[model samples]
Target: MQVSVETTQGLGRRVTITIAADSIETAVKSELVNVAKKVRIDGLRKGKVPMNIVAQRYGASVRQDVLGDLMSRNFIDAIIKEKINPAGAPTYVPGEYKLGEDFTYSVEFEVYPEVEL
Candidate 1:
């Protein structure tokens, strides 16, 4: 993932979290692992079906969930990790995803100004 962080005195801070193709691909892998524990497939015992099959069945839902989870979790985590004290709720700008390509998102929020330390 490529995160572009920028700040200005009047405009506040902007975080552009670019979701590369690899990131989404990796997320699918991780999501499949988690879903495998709960999914059941015919002709095979629960959790015994191959990931390929399970992926075929639940891939769409899993991908959506993973995307939501990633956005929510990583957004908060990024703010904390970056030590940005936000002044208000963030605004999530829209973005599109193309398989094997990058999905970009832009988020903006007012940040607490730095104090002399």
Candidate 2:
């Protein structure tokens, strides 16, 4: 994992987070096995679906589910590393994910301002 903070005007902050592709793929692959057991397919015994078939059936959806989970969870570590407290949820610009490569994204948000009291 890699994290960087971009200089911004005022309390506005931006963070870039990169995660290894292998980790993402591993999580999806493991989850697919669970999916295979739970789903029903014609002419297939329950919990006996082929791996490739399960991927073909649910790969895209599983990939997105894993991706979304990583993004939200990893953002916390990045925010902690950068030492900024966001006022609320961030707006994200996630980059494309190709197999065996790094996944990267940038998020922009405003942090808490200094108090005058």
Candidate 3:
């Protein structure tokens, strides 16, 4: 994950986040592995379904979940790295992310102002 921050205006910053496609794929597979261990498919024995099958059935939702989780984690860490306190939830511009392509998005948010001594 990479984050770039640019000051947009008074108390506002534009944050652009980029996440590698490989990392997203890895996370999706990781989530499916966890799910496979617990999910019981009707035709397949418990924990015996093929990875592809499990993914075929659950990939979309899992990917969405994984993306959300990753974004939140990265967002917080990025804010900390930039040493800024957000005043409220960020507004994200619409993005189209794919499994085999890098995901990037921009967020605009207000930050607490610095008071000079």
Candidate 4:
């Protein structure tokens, strides 16, 4: 994941974040493997379904689940990375995040002014 900040109009600060598609795919694959290990389907032995088959069956749904979990969890890390003390609750905007490309999002917030000497 990459975190970069830019000055937006007025006191609002914008943080642009990006996660490589390869990384996202890797995480999804890991989740699929776990799902295959624990799921029981009709006529199938427990934990015996082929990986490819399980991936084909649950890829899209699990992908969304994993991605959403990751983004929300990492948002806090991004704020910590910058030591950003938000004035209040921040608004998060998730942008176009297709399967084969980088996932991107932005967070906008009001920041406390530094107490300059």
Candidate 5:
């Protein structure tokens, strides 16, 4: 997975994670499961709520959380696993994106150098 984390309007960090299209579904599912454990539901105990219900209640917020987490995790994991020694963090650049068609995001962030080959 090739991921770029960038920021748009926020000051913290904007991230864009580019994962394989074939693995996107798996990544999404894994993230949803991770969130479901931490997410609190009305009728369910902690970490016991159904994902569908979690989605129904806090889907949007969860989506944001999960997406961010998944992106970061996948990015870092890929780098470490692949032994990619990057120079620094990445900055946001205007990129192309088509919703529901392909996976691409436009985000802004502090610029960093890529030292790995």
Candidate 6:
């Protein structure tokens, strides 16, 4: 994972986070494995569905869930790594995922304002 920071107008800072494709793929598969244990698909009996079938049937949704979790978790981690306090929630810029390529997304937000003591 790589993090890049860029300053925008005013107090805004754009934080870009890059995660390796393999990392995401591994997370997705790990989540799917957990899901398979509890997911009850028709005709598959409990805990017996094939990995491919579960993945094909629920890949998009699973990926979305995994990505969202990662984004939220990593956002704070990145913020702390950058050593800046942000004001308010961030506005995330959408990015696409490409196989065998890095996944990158940017979040724009204002830094904490300076206050006179």
RMSD of each: 3.0, 2.0, 2.1, 2.6, 8.0, 1.9
Q: Cα miss at 77, model 5 (Å)?
A: 8.1
Using TM-score, rank the candidates from best to worst.
6, 3, 2, 4, 1, 5
In candidate 6, stretches whose alpha carbon ends up further than 4 angstroms from where it belongs are 41-45, 114-116
| Cα lDDT tens digits for candidate 5, 84-111 | 4443564434344332233544333343
Lowest lDDT block of 10, candidate 1: 39-48
**For every model in order, what is the number of clashing pairs?**
0, 0, 0, 0, 10, 0
lDDT of 4 by residue, 44-114 (tens): 78888878888888999999998888787777888897888778888889999886889999889988878
lDDT of 3: 0.85
Q: In candidate 5, residue 33 scores what lDDT? A: 77
* Top candidate (lDDT): 2
Candidate closer to the true structure by lDDT (higher is better), 1 or 4? 4
Query: Taking the tens digit of each residue's C-alpha lDDT, what string does model 2 give over 11-45?
Result: 88889889889889899999998898897777767
> Which residue ranges in model 3 land beyond 4 Å of their true spot?
43-45, 114-117
RMSD to native, candidate 3: 2.1
- CA-lDDT, candidates in order: 0.78, 0.86, 0.85, 0.85, 0.54, 0.85
lDDT of 6 by residue, 1-117 (tens): 888999998888999998888888899899999888988878767989888888898888988887878877787899998797888888988589776677889889999757888
Query: Which lDDT value does model 5 have at 27?
Result: 54
Ranking by lDDT: 2, 4, 6, 3, 1, 5
TM-score, per-candidate, Cα-based: 0.75, 0.87, 0.87, 0.82, 0.43, 0.87
